[PDB]
Amino acid sequence: TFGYVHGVSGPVVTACDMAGAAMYELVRVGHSELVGEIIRLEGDMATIQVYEETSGVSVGDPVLRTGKPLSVELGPGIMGAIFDGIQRPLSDISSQTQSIYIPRGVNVSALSRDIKWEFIPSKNLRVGSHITGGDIYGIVNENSLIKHKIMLPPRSRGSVTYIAPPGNYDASDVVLELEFEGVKEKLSMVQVWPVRQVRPVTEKLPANHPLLTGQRVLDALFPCVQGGTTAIPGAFGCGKTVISQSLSKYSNSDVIIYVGCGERGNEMSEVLRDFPELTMEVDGKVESIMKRTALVANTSNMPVAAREASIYTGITLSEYFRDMGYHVSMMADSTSRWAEALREISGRLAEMPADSGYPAYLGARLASFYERAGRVKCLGNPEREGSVSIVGAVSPPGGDFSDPVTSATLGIVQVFWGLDKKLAQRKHFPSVNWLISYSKYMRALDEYYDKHFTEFVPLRTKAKEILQEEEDLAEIVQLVGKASLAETDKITLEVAKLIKDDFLQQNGYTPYDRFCPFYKTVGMLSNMISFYDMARRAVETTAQSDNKITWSIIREHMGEILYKLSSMKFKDPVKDGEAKIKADYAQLLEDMQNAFRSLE
Amino acid sequence: YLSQPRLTYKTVSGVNGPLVILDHVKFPRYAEIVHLTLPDGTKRSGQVLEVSGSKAVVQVFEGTSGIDAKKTSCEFTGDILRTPVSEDMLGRVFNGSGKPIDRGPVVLAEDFLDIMGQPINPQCRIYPEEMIQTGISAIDGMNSIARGQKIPIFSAAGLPHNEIAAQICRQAGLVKKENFAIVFAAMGVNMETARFFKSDFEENGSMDNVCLFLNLANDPTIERIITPRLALTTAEFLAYQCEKHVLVILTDMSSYAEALREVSAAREEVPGRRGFPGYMYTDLATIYERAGRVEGRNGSITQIPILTMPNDDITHPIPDLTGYITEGQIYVDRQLHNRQIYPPINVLPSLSRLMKSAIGEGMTRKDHADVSNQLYACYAIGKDVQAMKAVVGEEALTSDDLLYLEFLQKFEKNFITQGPYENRTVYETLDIGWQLLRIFPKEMLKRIPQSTLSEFYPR
């Protein structure tokens, strides 16, 4: 299984006596076991792309051939760990060496083999039964949150010949044995899957269930759905932290994966430092987010193969849990950083460049990336379902949208949560641009909204109409000063402000506003829009002659109603239950209608 | 037929990108298909794009990941990719490789046709002289569609070009006052887009006359440059051997161009613009020109090669080279979409190169050509007036300019705006044209002769 190094021209190593090798196989070059891949082959010689520095590699050094191509190791212990872009545990490398550096040629198994995991068989299987790919034959108890379900690896099937009894097993033992056509396969708790291969599913389903984030903006106006794909701009002043924390802390997904592609060292530290300190209430207990999270960390000075592969390593980990029936939410910190890594590799391979210097296949790679997300029907007899969402960020050089990476991304993702810096400078958070942002899942979610809430859809339609009109009136206001202006337009302007202030704006550093349940979000909007309609009618039905209602009359007459509307965001769901908050909102609705009634 | 046993080789010389190079091959044939098995049993196929002596270069469709050098087993079929075709392919769903994906059987061939096809003898090609009624005023009036014409929709990411194509599939008839077999090549698209069309075809109750070819974003990029040929090859069988009128729709042709560009880079071919092969035009003509009627046979093929314009750049090689080959374009844009106008079809940069013969006395109404030309003049001028007024202000305009702003405003909401299920006749479209033209006095309708104005304008 060994060959020899024939020569080194830099990061490219030529091997000889390596006839039995496949393209995009893996090799460990030299006595330090440098990680690389075989790209070009000719005769019994192979051209190896080495990820790490090749200094010191000699002619005649050994090359160890590894049968599996670039793959992700999947099994118990994946949760709570931080990995390199090519699946190297950074928390073990720094702890098994006492070093601060990643050793050159470091060879630490992705999942430690010194942990005795608590494994319980399904208790439904027997020796002699039939099992197929995707079937679950036992569960490992990792922590209080996520059960780590052990599936039969895809592309395997047969008759069960041995089932391990319940007990403590490590990742190097044998848990299940199966025989197919006389061939016996011994399986442990860990499966290996090529990172560039898409894990099969029974069927790909439409995404209909909302992604229940905790923000009023980026939900009511711009919905995301479980299994959907969105993009978020990543600029210093955009306030992207709000989405990252809100999505990772309170989301209705089961597993969070955060993927770095190749960011600044200090930025990777900020993510690695923040995440372990995040908590959420679960069963009344406060649990660390890292018990249901996995993170892949890549800085700009990591091997380019890892920075390019990081994005696919993340989604492979995501699909692994998708196949368990979990809802997984993956964030790519910067897909622009990935695209940069990809261009570098194309350059190293002396490929002809295309648009703005990027590889000709940039679009094909992004399209196949996002296509892997979605709600699916899982493999295996348990007839379980799950999904993967992608909320990858884009950060093109210069902030322009002409860069092929951002342009291609926007043509692929169905939701764009366009953020702005001006809003952050104004201290308005979340920093959502509103006019640029869009969601193309509004139709897909109409069935859910109609079934469970009914009035939500006309409310979000009116809300966008009010906000857009507020923008449309901007030129009239600038040239007029609200003097030569219709009273109906004054309602639009002042109510639109009310919406911007006491609905779309949310203060995540307050205990009452940490998370806004949907029923509260629609409650708040319903009363504001109901006010809008009542104010429009109060003016319009009396605007003929003699005795008319104006905004000055409405504002002065029922100022307590405008105050009560602004106060609605303070209804803390932790102390005031669903019935109490709805009851108080119902009282405002009645008081509001009566306030206008007193004017007619 | 080919009675001699095929040879199997384990003589792979080397692998370089998507190309597997074999040596020691007996009498290599150019553009023959090779079937290869990987050490793990995976089966893949490719085509010989070059032969030299005992060597041959095979481009593998599925890809070259996992291809070995010692255990790889290849066999040469001994012919070119000739594909099975039958009439009963309508109602079936295939992948981009020509295999069924609807849980039905493989194709029970009536014959085998060369995917490369043959050029139609221009002496027997018969000029199109029949109009298709699309029901869309923006098309039937100012850019008519002939039966056998090639009209892509130039669009941009996020615009409803899929809805327009779907609409055309249901309400496309004739103006002779008819069931088209539709072949839909879904390449480089996501599941939801392919499911959108498949569901619409069933909703329309026409699925028994629809043949689908799917090659999704997660499918190999090399198969994406045979899918159009598979669709058109089937269309040729139906149209020219079974005298069935066929409508062939190719989804974002830009995924074809990108798949082609990748192959061009891999083979180090001479680039033209934006990295695309210098022969991109010739390759596109091979796909596009498989259309039109043939004298003496009652079939036809009509194409709608919809394509996405990268960054809305109308001069990008993809729309540019297409514009040179096809008989014009419908072209949608964002300026109409951003105002909730559907269909968002912008007539100004559009044209139909067969319109001059498919309209008028004996075809639709004798004033058709005159109404279209004047509407183009009035629409373009209204746009010119906005370009001026944006700087000089409304007070700088005279009555001669305000008329074009009134026309432009009424034109877009009355003529272009319709809705996904608004099916207008060609005669209703012209009547609407006149309603807009009657905004102006006769003297300003300078593209229309008095021999037409005197009859139609008074009404």
Partner: peptide, 19 residues
């Protein structure tokens, strides 16, 4: 870039022939 790539490949081909 295209021309330089072909120049580098032609140089490699010339070198192999000389060996």
């Amino acid at each position: 870039f295209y021309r330089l790539k072909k120049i580098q490949e032609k140089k490699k081909i010339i070198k192999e022939k000389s060996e």
